[PDB]
Amino acid sequence: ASLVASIVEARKKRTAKKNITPYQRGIIRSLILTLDCSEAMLEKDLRPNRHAMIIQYAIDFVHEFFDQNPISQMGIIIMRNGLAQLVSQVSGNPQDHIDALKSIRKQEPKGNPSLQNALEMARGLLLPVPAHCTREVLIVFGSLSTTDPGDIHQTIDSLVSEKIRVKVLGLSAQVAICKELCKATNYGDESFYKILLDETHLKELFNEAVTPLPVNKINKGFTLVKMGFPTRIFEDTPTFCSCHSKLVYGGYFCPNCHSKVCSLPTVCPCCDLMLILSTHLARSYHHLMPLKTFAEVPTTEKFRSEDCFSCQSRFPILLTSSRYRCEDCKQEFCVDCDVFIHEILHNCPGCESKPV
Amino acid sequence: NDERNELKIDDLNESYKTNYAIIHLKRNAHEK
Amino acid sequence: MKFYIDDLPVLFPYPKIYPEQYNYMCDIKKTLDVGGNSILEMPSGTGKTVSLLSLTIAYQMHYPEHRKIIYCSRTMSEIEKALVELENLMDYRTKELGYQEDFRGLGLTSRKNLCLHPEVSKERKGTVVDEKCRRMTNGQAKRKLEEDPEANVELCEYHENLYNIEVEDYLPKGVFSFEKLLKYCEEKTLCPYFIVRRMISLCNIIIYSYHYLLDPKIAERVSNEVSKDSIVIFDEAHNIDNVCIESLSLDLTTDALRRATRGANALDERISEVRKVDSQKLQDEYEKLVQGLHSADILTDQEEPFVETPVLPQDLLTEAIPGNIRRAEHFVSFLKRLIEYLKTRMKVLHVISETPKSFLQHLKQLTFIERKPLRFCSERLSLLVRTLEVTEVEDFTALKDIATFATLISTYEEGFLLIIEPYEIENAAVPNPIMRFTCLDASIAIKPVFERFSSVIITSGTISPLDMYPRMLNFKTVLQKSYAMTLAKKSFLPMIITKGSDQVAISSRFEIRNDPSIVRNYGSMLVEFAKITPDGMVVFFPSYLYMESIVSMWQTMGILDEVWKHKLILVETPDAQETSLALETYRKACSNGRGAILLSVARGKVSEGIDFDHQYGRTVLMIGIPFQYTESRILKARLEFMRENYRIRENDFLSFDAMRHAAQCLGRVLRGKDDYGVMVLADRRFSRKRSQLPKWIAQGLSDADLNLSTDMAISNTKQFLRTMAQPTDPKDQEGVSVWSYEDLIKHQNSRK
Numbered sequence A: 001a002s003l004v005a006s007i008v009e010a011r012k013k014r015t016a017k018k019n020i021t022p023y024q025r026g027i028i029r030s031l032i033l034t035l036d037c038s039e040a041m042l043e044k045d046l047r048p049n050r051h052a053m054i055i056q057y058a059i060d061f062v063h064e065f066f067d068q069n070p071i072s073q074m075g076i077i078i079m080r081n082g083l084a085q086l087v088s089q090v091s092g093n094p095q096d097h098i099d100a101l102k103s104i105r106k107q108e109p110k111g112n113p114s115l116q117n118a119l120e121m122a123r124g125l126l127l128p129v130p131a132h133c134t135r136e137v138l139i140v141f142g143s144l145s146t147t148d149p150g151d152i153h154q155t156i157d158s159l160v161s162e163k164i165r166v167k168v169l170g171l172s173a174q175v176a177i178c179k180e181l182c183k184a185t186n187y188g189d190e191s192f193y194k195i196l197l198d199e200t201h202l203k204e205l206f207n208e209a210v211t212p213l214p215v216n217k218i219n220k221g222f223t224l225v226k227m228g229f230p231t232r233i234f235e236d237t238p239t240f241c242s243c244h245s246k247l248v249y250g251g252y253f254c255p256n257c258h259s260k261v262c263s264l265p266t267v268c269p270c271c272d273l274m275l276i277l278s279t280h281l282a283r284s285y286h287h288l289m290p291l292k293t294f295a296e297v298p299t300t301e302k303f304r305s306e307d308c309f310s311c312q313s314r315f316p317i318l319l320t321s322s323r324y325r326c327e328d329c330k331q332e333f334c335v336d337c338d339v340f341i342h343e344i345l346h347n348c349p350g351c352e353s354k355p356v
Numbered sequence B: 001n002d003e004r005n006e007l008k009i010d011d012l013n014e015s016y017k018t019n020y021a022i023i024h025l026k027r028n029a030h031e032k
Numbered sequence C: 001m002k003f004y005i006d007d008l009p010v011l012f013p014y015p016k017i018y019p020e021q022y023n024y025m026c027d028i029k030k031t032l033d034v035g036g037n038s039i040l041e042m043p044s045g046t047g048k049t050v051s052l053l054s055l056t057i058a059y060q061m062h063y064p065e066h067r068k069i070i071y072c073s074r075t076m077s078e079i080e081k082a083l084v085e086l087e088n089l090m091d092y093r094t095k096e097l098g099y100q101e102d103f104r105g106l107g108l109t110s111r112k113n114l115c116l117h118p119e120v121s122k123e124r125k126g127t128v129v130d131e132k133c134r135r136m137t138n139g140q141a142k143r144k145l146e147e148d149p150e151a152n153v154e155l156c157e158y159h160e161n162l163y164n165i166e167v168e169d170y171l172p173k174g175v176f177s178f179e180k181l182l183k184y185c186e187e188k189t190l191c192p193y194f195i196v197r198r199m200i201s202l203c204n205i206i207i208y209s210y211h212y213l214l215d216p217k218i219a220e221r222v223s224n225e226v227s228k229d230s231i232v233i234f235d236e237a238h239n240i241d242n243v244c245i246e247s248l249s250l251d252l253t254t255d256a257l258r259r260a261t262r263g264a265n266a267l268d269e270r271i272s273e274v275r276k277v278d279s280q281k282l283q284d285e286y287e288k289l290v291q292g293l294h295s296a297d298i299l300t301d302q303e304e305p306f307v308e309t310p311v312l313p314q315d316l317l318t319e320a321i322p323g324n325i326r327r328a329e330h331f332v333s334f335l336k337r338l339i340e341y342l343k344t345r346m347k348v349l350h351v352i353s354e355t356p357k358s359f360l361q362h363l364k365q366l367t368f369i370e371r372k373p374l375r376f377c378s379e380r381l382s383l384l385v386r387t388l389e390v391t392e393v394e395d396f397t398a399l400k401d402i403a404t405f406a407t408l409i410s411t412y413e414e415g416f417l418l419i420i421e422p423y424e425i426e427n428a429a430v431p432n433p434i435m436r437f438t439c440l441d442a443s444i445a446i447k448p449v450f451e452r453f454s455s456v457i458i459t460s461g462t463i464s465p466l467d468m469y470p471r472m473l474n475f476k477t478v479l480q481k482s483y484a485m486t487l488a489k490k491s492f493l494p495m496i497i498t499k500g501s502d503q504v505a506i507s508s509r510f511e512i513r514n515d516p517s518i519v520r521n522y523g524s525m526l527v528e529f530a531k532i533t534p535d536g537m538v539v540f541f542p543s544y545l546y547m548e549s550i551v552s553m554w555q556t557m558g559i560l561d562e563v564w565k566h567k568l569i570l571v572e573t574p575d576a577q578e579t580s581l582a583l584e585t586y587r588k589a590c591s592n593g594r595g596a597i598l599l600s601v602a603r604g605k606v607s608e609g610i611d612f613d614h615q616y617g618r619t620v621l622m623i624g625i626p627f628q629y630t631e632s633r634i635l636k637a638r639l640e641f642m643r644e645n646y647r648i649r650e651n652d653f654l655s656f657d658a659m660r661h662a663a664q665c666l667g668r669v670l671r672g673k674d675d676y677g678v679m680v681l682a683d684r685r686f687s688r689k690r691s692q693l694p695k696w697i698a699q700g701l702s703d704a705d706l707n708l709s710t711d712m713a714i715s716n717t718k719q720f721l722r723t724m725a726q727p728t729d730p731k732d733q734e735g736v737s738v739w740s741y742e743d744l745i746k747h748q749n750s751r752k
């Protein structure tokens, strides 16, 4: 039963994974990461303290966010002494934000938190953002109280008017205003206010925010965005970069004004045209054609082959059949491959091999 | 108006339903 | 939904339903169909008002009898909530049946709550409001204006505009809450008070407070209009005995008698003045008095007696006026020497408790006042005032107290006691004698109700133990039961704190209120809970004086300074309006995330109808068991009376009284099953009262939480609050705690 207990839990874990529909997701994002640095963040419930762990996971989130959302941008704000302090402008450079977070890691948190000040600052940072982007604010909250100079309800109404979306990660318990902010802003959904229960669950919560948010059916901002695919040049003598005005050896040439840029993806400093590589778009294709989940095969029927289709690992004999099949191609897969086929790879090897 | 909403029992009402839009990506294009 | 009981179709205004609500409705219908009384105790986290209205309204609309409904709450604020629920239920019925059925539902309250006159609604007390409205609506102004238009007496446009239209057309069909009623009447310049009072005989459901059913002063007029076969619901009747006792009680002070002699002298002067110029009025009244008429036959339906009938209508003598007080001057002399006897009885030097018979005997000895004339004192005074044209009655107001005392002490002799104390406040430089006429039996005022009406439902969230209410109030029930909420995941954490973090015992005993250790131990608990409570935190104290002393002590200690950093401090004050403003501020701070803490009294105004659910309440801090002041003559007399008559031990009743208030405050924190909060009972004496708590609260109180420390309660609270913030699994509550229509049908199939 103990081994069966593992099986049934595995089936229950798979139950959630069974439902996968090709939701429309906003690939081009514009995130504002708000961190809480107040007296309440000096506690020791998270080792060594709340401030240290939050900053560390923020750096990891920055790495993951820009890895899977290459054509997005991020800005970082913190709450200190009842004021909102800006530490990073909206930009597509993942290194600027990590450097800012590392600097923040030293100073001791103190004072009171102010959601209204942070929300107002985030509202202003997302003003010069195109209409095709998804304006999002991810607040990491640790306090149980808010000291604001004005009416927070008016700010919430303004946020809803500007089509900004708020996700809040609380530390100890539910705050009434945070629930309202995450609900009135997400079209009534109450799943965007998450309260962790341990260190491990926090890492999952940060990891979940990396993926793009599905869009609402009545919020239509469909448009064609003018992009550019520059050609990398290899030069013999250094040349000035049009973005930082410093000598670098080689850089991509924009096809609209021929000015060179150090790194991609960025908006060209001259023609204001986004420069990206084809790979940066290919990094998001798995969010538009998600691979349909694999369902275990009951032992009543007869199996096809003794070994895995893609990895040639013989299935153990053991109660519970250790086989998962792809309905599209009907090829059995080992339990190990299916995790790697749906998290690292995003194409079923069986489907590709089949000719049409 | 406002008082009525507070007196109502929210837990006994229908659960919130998501209204997310789906996209079906057809795949067909000319060769290079 | 729309489901079926044995033959009654009932339309619930929600698509889902709790198992408790369905069982509650089934039991109510069983009681209604079988006849008799019942005592039902449903938890507070389950919708009770909606279930009651849903079933009862359906019951009245389906059966041929079409029995009416009387809904009794304990405060005016509850009438609004009931009316709002009624409006929501009826709107659902109007949308599912395809038409608005013939239905009228109105609330009822005093003029002060419903006066639209720009100059009479600006008063700070309801007695003055009644006087001014009576001056403009008695008919004296109208008759004088009819005879001579030049008269300067004014009227109320609201009252006058009603005479143009018929009583059946005062309001459109439907349910009218006070908020809606005032808005409608303002747009048409009508009096909501007179519209309601003139439509009680036409309402399918009438909602008023207990004071309009038990207090004989304001009950008789309202009672004569309701039907005899109506359904009677006693909502939140866990403290109904207190209402029943204050209805037949009175207090006299030295200032009252000193103000009564002036009024009697003024009345004699007025009689002399009227005798000189206009004497036919006196003879006309005397002639009718000789015939045998009373206030009912002399007074028009438009006018009201000056002295409200202080006794139950069944105990009023039906014989003619005795003759001693038949003339104006003789009655005044009768009244004056009665006042003198009361004054000479206020000079005692020790507490004297006597029966009404002994007081009457001594009165008949020192003076020569007999029992029978004393019974007509209130009835006669109203006639004398009515015939004297007393346009301003400020002088005669004090006489209403003497008349009320006279008609009470001469009517009842069993279950009543007269206490005379030389010290109303023992902590006073100069004695201030007081005379209290107290009612010991709580069933005297409720006896007419349980006999007039066939079916009565006594329901409340914390009415336990259920056996004591039939004992205390002499009535019998067909069924008495309490439901246990089938909550999938525990939603409320009830804990008992017996000592502080230093393990020193904590208690709210009044004799040790000024103790540096207990004061600091309670303050530390207040601060620590204020640190982990997310939004709202209500703190209840055994008495207002205890709260005043301890809060002042905390200020010196500096404990309040620590609380101010995390939450705003709102305090209950003797003034009602200021406390209402405090409630408004406390709710506002809870909503916007600022966080607030509300310090109130367990037996105060906040605890008798204000609910702190969701964010308005996430933790309840019961600072001590809310015991009464034991060294009270009234309470000791009542305890002795109950012990001899109903065989209730004094300690048992005192504990029952204290727990019925502690539980009362605990249940005001849950509205639905998605609501959660922590209930902490901070007293070493609470540890043995778990069996005395309501069943649904006791079941949630674990054996490890019976005697906790402050630190151990904080750690559990932190874990519980963290656990309640997680997304609940729908399947865990899909069909065990919340029912769809399909689930309900299944439950009807397996049971049958």
Ligand code: SF4
Binding pocket: C111, C114, C115, C116, C117, C120, C132, C133, C134, C136, C137, C156, C158, C159, C190, C191, C192, C193, C194
């Ligand atoms: S009739 Fe109504 S509005 Fe006019 S004074 Fe009396 S209570 Fe007030």
Ligand SMILES: [Zn+2]
Binding pocket: A241, A242, A243, A244, A245, A246, A261, A262
């Ligand atoms: Zn550069």
Ligand SMILES: [Zn+2]
Binding pocket: A254, A255, A256, A257, A258, A259, A268, A269, A270, A271, A272, A273
């Ligand atoms: Zn360019």
Ligand SMILES: [Zn+2]
Binding pocket: A308, A309, A310, A311, A312, A313, A333, A334, A335, A336, A337, A338
């Ligand atoms: Zn494999």
Ligand SMILES: [Zn+2]
Binding pocket: A326, A327, A328, A329, A330, A331, A348, A349, A350, A351
């Ligand atoms: Zn496949």
